[PDB]
Design a protein around this ligand. Sequence first.
Ligand SMILES: CC(=O)N[C@@H]1[C@@H](O)[C@H](O[C@@H]2O[C@H](CO)[C@@H](O[C@@H]3O[C@H](CO)[C@@H](O[C@@H]4O[C@H](CO)[C@@H](O[C@@H]5O[C@H](CO)[C@@H](O)[C@H](O)[C@H]5NC(C)=O)[C@H](O)[C@H]4NC(C)=O)[C@H](O)[C@H]3NC(C)=O)[C@H](O)[C@H]2NC(C)=O)[C@@H](CO)O[C@@H]1O
Ligand code: NA
Length: 528
Amino acid sequence: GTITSQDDNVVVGYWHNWCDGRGYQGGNAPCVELKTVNPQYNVVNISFMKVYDIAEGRIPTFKLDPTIALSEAEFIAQIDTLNSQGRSVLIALGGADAHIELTRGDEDALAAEIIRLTDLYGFDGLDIDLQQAAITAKDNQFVIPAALKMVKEHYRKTGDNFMITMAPEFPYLTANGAYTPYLTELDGYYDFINPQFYNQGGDGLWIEGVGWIAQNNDALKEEFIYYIADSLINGTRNYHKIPHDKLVFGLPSNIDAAATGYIQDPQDLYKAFDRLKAQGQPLRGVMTWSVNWDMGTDAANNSYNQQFIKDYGNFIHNQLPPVTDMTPTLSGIVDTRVELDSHFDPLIGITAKDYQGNDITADVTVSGSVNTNQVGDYLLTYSVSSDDETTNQPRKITVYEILPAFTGITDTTVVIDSEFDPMQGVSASHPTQGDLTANITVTGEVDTNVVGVYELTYQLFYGQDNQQNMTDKRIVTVVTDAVSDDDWQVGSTYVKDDKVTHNGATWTAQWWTKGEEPGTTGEWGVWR
Ligand SMILES: CC(=O)N[C@@H]1[C@@H](O)[C@H](O[C@@H]2O[C@H](CO)[C@@H](O[C@@H]3O[C@H](CO)[C@@H](O[C@@H]4O[C@H](CO)[C@@H](O[C@@H]5O[C@H](CO)[C@@H](O)[C@H](O)[C@H]5NC(C)=O)[C@H](O)[C@H]4NC(C)=O)[C@H](O)[C@H]3NC(C)=O)[C@H](O)[C@H]2NC(C)=O)[C@@H](CO)O[C@@H]1O
Ligand code: NA
């Protein structure tokens, strides 16, 4: 077949490239032939493309499991059958426990291998299902998008829409989260995203005014679906925006398919989707891990017997076609701190794209102005318009000033008649004004001829016209080098004629003493 893409709603189902997988509740997922997958799965994702052995190098590939007892030619024939029915068959990249680790420069080879596989098997696109370390490993976040742009562009040349989808686990979809480079680099290139709303336990989101709604909360499942979808399709509540026409809700087929996330009561999904439709934002479909689980058995060897497609196929297909959200995007805008009098350029680092991923950076406009010569906050708003839609985003610029620092102003003791230079070892600096030593004045003097304690007040003047100032005080004590009688000690014993220094005076013992303080023994006592 040819490249077969989906224009309307989708029910996506992963297909296991292996047999008899064990379920989270002890069930079993048989391998199944593609031609047996229920027709209402209009996108079927071959799982998985990955590195099958590092002796083949870093570029991942796909190798059909022969125990499924499809020859290569037969597998190709069943893909062609699905394509003849207008269904798409994508190759899923990654999966659980698949490590992929690419280096900048691997993008040409990855693209070449994607195309090779696509042309050989009849695949219609590729699903990004990077998990754990593979999301962020080495240069993956650059290489994988770059490769896929090439692949898209290669098939566009012949008028074919090579589909690109992704299956991020929903916790990675916060605004600056690990999947964000894939989503932003491929804006305009991807057909839809089918996040996983399973296996995340008690993770979820905080709804200001209703509380924490967890993915494992079966009492609040309607609210979970509604609010996490509402946040995603509007870029609110700290989630990255995925337009509603491009959001497909991923679910486990049953309790064996994933540890948590199974919808016990399909009504909760019907109602959440209906609510989303009611505010003008119908979703694009559902996704499931997996067709094999939908055709599998539980631990008691009872058949699941297609309960997932029974619950969701007709509901999702019997909907109007999607309506494209053509809002443009802005990238690069972050509140920024700028030091007083530095240069600031409000356009550097900021870019914009239309909904098809075309660069429209030159079309951005900015209102507001920053005055880097005055500390304070300044608010800018960036705007861009395309396709009769407009996106805006604020940016706070804070102008701040840093105090200079003195060095060398430490209390010190010097000997009588020594030379003392109050500026010796003293400096000031500032990060932007540089050496400010010449801006320091000294109030007070030290007289090194006269024993005593001398205070010096250092002032630094800085800033515009030197009208800012800071002060620091220093004590310089001048001590004699004159040797004197040893200080009186309260525990020492003295005898007649012994002399001691105490309380600034020299005293002479008149007889035996221990523990009597000089100066306190009166007109006629032991110390005189
Ligand atoms: C206490 C609490 O609430 N804790 C929370 C955490 O649980 C949670 O973090 C998640 O933690 C779970 C493990 O507890 C971790 O689980 C993986 O989930 C991924 C994503 O769904 C699973 O991968 C997909 O799901 C199916 C299985 O449901 C995968 O199917 C398997 O595929 C392999 C081949 O690749 C086969 O060998 C297997 O047989 C097959 N399994 C089955 C049953 O068929 C499929 O490959 C994946 N892709 C898709 C499209 O479905 C992965 O299997 C789960 N691993 C395990 C060991 O169970 C999940 O990834 C953690 N999430 C994160 C973000 O790290 C956090 C989340 O914030 O919150 C709490 O802390
Ligand atoms: Na095809």
